[PDB]
Design a protein around this ligand. Structure first.
Ligand SMILES: [N]C(=O)C1=[C][N+]([C]2O[C]([C]OP(=O)([O-])OP([O])(=O)O[C][C]3O[C](N4[C]=NC5=C4N=[C]N=C5[N])[C]([O])[C]3[O])[C]([O])[C]2[O])=[C][C]=C1N1=[C]C(I)=[C][N]1
Ligand SMILES: NC(=O)c1ccc[n+]([C@@H]2O[C@H](COP(=O)([O-])OP(=O)(O)OC[C@H]3O[C@@H](n4cnc5c(N)ncnc54)[C@H](O)[C@@H]3O)[C@@H](O)[C@H]2O)c1
Ligand SMILES: [Cl-]
Ligand SMILES: [Zn+2]
Ligand SMILES: [Zn+2]
Ligand SMILES: [Zn+2]
Ligand SMILES: [Zn+2]
Lengths: 374, 374
């Protein structure tokens, strides 16, 4: 079959920034001890993959991007015990090693084995498993899912329900868990509260769902693209506003609309201005502002400390606060039990080969979550 | 009786910024409905009072400062149901109107009837009560305690135990509650956690106490004034560090000795550089940084939101997060229950008239909490 042997498959390689994805033939090496080789079934296009392409997120190039996915274990390396071939799995962009200070803390999830802080672009052992034209290709967030087959560390993969529809549940790999957890875990939206969500893509809309689920009484959705309004309202938004319709700065508008400011603001775009407006629109005395969007590299915000002194809370989080390996499978169970649906988010489905077309949809703002099938 | 009549007394008025306080004769008009005229018995010198003197905190001048205090109800206005003459009381720089959005929210205390956000220098009805040489003198934070008599709104005054040593219990009026509550109420320091406290003035030392009461395992006290360490140690600090002894940045020094960073850091000074170090020294994935120090006017920080995205929580609070009308007396009760001691804080006791000498000791750093008696 393929276990123990090198696999030669297709992968979308980014050789340089601001350049189209090149579909190459790569050699995927067999998994070492404590690694799992996965056969991809469905991958979602997260903006963070785009952040690398536009040059806003730095990470070693050439590289195989992708981190929102679902697939089947092709083989496991010696030592692997949490999963076996044929198992349906979801690769996790933030591992859960279970040994570190962070992992052993019940309230934090940014595991110390991540590759976000200082991007080595390798697996946890400091080595790569891809080769294209003889040249070694870097991994992204230790998942590199834009490939027919990838190898990830064991603590970076979760075994999910065998009955899970992979083309739906892959969104739980990032988009959904990130947005839903931001509301539910990170901010911890109280019942009867008012929330404002800035940005309405797959992640932001999921944040709307999580606010709805938290029992928020009012959910104001903000986006400059009005086409997103139908979905937003459908998912729980009590009202949607377009900053371009006003002469006043977005935060004053919200302050006036909510008797002084929302209780929870969510920045789910990744811009300095929306991050500021987001902190500004929540009530000075009892507002919590949560940053979900990923900021452009080495950009700084100028903030007057007095904004926080009155009683505001500013915080950010990766993966919606979910301890990865432990939390994702549970969200899949919730999906199976029909606790929430992912159908409104998936607007486009294309074959992996059309990956570039997928990104064009994101750029045009015509798509929410686009899924690539292998 | 003096009730109904205008009281003529001595008060430390400030006419110009950065000039000595003038002990003059002012006229304290009688309390209007819902107001209380209090006879000051002991006022403490809080660093914020100094901020107005130095120009760091802007407020209308002329003004009678002072807010950390205790006294006896001289007389009450019409409709006053919470206090009666003779009742030992404590004025609150932040009131608890009890009927506003912030007051109805259990997790917040910045009552909308405060005079910090936008200083008017008046009592809640928009008018002044003091006069000096034919001119009206402004109030400060609605309290104005550097006067033998003062008039405060009912919701900005709390009655305490009719046996409380007002010469000590006055620290609960600001300094102690602010620091203590910041650890207990705002950070919500967890048992076995590791904390860092930048600034060992009366408020920092109080935070140390609160960090120990919460059951922190390590309390690293940071200060350039070496003479504070003995007190810090005495109050619970596991170790004291002086930034000047190092050739390396204090934040780095602190991360290196706490395996990545502390769990809860507190900035209890009011400088931007210290507020930055304080944010930087708490673990990037599970650290909560709390701002206690009132920063200088108009100055603001430059931060990379990536500092928050990984898991950090940044918040600030006034009055240690305590809802003034309810928390202050409760605190006194605990003091009355001998649960804590303010003796280690009060380092100098001066007669009201020696007020300028008080601020001199504060500027020299050879004092923690100086009390002025009447
Ligand atoms: N934290 C975490 O974890 C995360 C994050 N993230 C981020 O977030 C963001 C967003 O996402 P998305 O959803 O995917 O995207 P999109 O689709 O693109 O959306 C966007 C939106 O928004 C809007 N806008 C823009 N601009 C504007 C707006 N609104 C308003 N205003 C303005 N100006 C548009 O229209 C649309 O709708 C980003 O940043 C991302 O990145 C994600 C995820 C998660 N992670 C982490 C990771 I290292 C990976 N991932
Ligand atoms: N948030 C509030 O409710 C609230 C309440 C009371 C006071 N405050 C503010 O908290 C701050 C301090 O209060 P305080 O009464 O304890 O003041 P304080 O001046 O007596 O204490 C300042 C301490 O900081 C130390 N310090 C100064 N620069 C330092 C540095 N660069 N590095 C390390 N240590 C340094 C000084 O040696 C001193 O020990 C002030 O801004 C005060 O206005 C805020
Ligand atoms: Cl007047
Ligand atoms: Zn993502
Ligand atoms: Zn870990
Ligand atoms: Zn109020
Ligand atoms: Zn004070």
């Amino acid at each position: 079959s393929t276990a123990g042997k090198v696999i030669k498959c297709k992968a979308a390689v980014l050789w340089e920034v601001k350049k189209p994805f090149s579909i190459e033939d790569v050699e995927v090496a067999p998994p070492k001890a404590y690694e799992v080789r996965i056969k991809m079934v469905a991958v979602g296009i997260c903006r963070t993959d785009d952040h690398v392409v536009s040059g806003n997120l730095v990470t070693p190039l050439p590289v195989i991007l992708g981190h929102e996915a679902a697939g089947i274990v092709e083989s496991v390396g010696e030592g692997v015990t949490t999963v076996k071939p044929g198992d349906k799995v979801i690769p996790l962009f933030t591992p859960q090693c279970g040994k570190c200070r962070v992992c052993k803390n019940p309230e934090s999830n940014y595991c110390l084995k991540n590759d976000l802080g200082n991007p080595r672009g390798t697996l946890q052992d400091g080595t790569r498993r891809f080769t294209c034209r003889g040249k070694p290709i870097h991994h992204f967030l230790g998942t590199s899912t834009f490939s027919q087959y990838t190898v990830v560390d064991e603590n970076a993969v979760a075994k999910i329900d065998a009955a899970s529809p992979l083309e739906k549940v892959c969104l739980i790999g990032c988009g959904f868990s990130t947005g839903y957890g931001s509301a539910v875990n990170v901010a911890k939206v109280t019942p009867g509260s008012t929330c404002a969500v800035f940005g309405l893509g797959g992640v932001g809309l999921s944040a709307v769902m999580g606010c709805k689920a938290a029992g928020a009484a009012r959910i104001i959705a903000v986006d400059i693209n009005k086409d997103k309004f139908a979905k937003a309202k459908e998912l729980g938004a009590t009202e949607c506003i377009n900053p371009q319709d006003y002469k006043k700065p977005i935060q004053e508008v919200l302050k006036e609309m909510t008797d002084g400011g929302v209780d929870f603001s969510f920045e789910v775009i990744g811009r300095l201005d929306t991050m500021m407006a987001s902190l500004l629109c929540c009530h000075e005395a009892c507002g919590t502002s949560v940053i979900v969007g990923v900021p452009p590299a080495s950009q700084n915000l100028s903030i007057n400390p007095m904004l926080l002194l009155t009683g505001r809370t500013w915080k950010g989080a990766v993966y919606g606060g979910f301890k990865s390996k432990e939390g994702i499978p549970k969200l899949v169970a919730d999906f199976m039990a029909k606790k929430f649906s992912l159908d409104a988010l998936i607007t486009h489905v294309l074959p992996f080969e059309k990956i570039n077309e997928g990104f064009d949809l994101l750029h045009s703002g015509k798509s929410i979550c686009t899924v690539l099938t292998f």
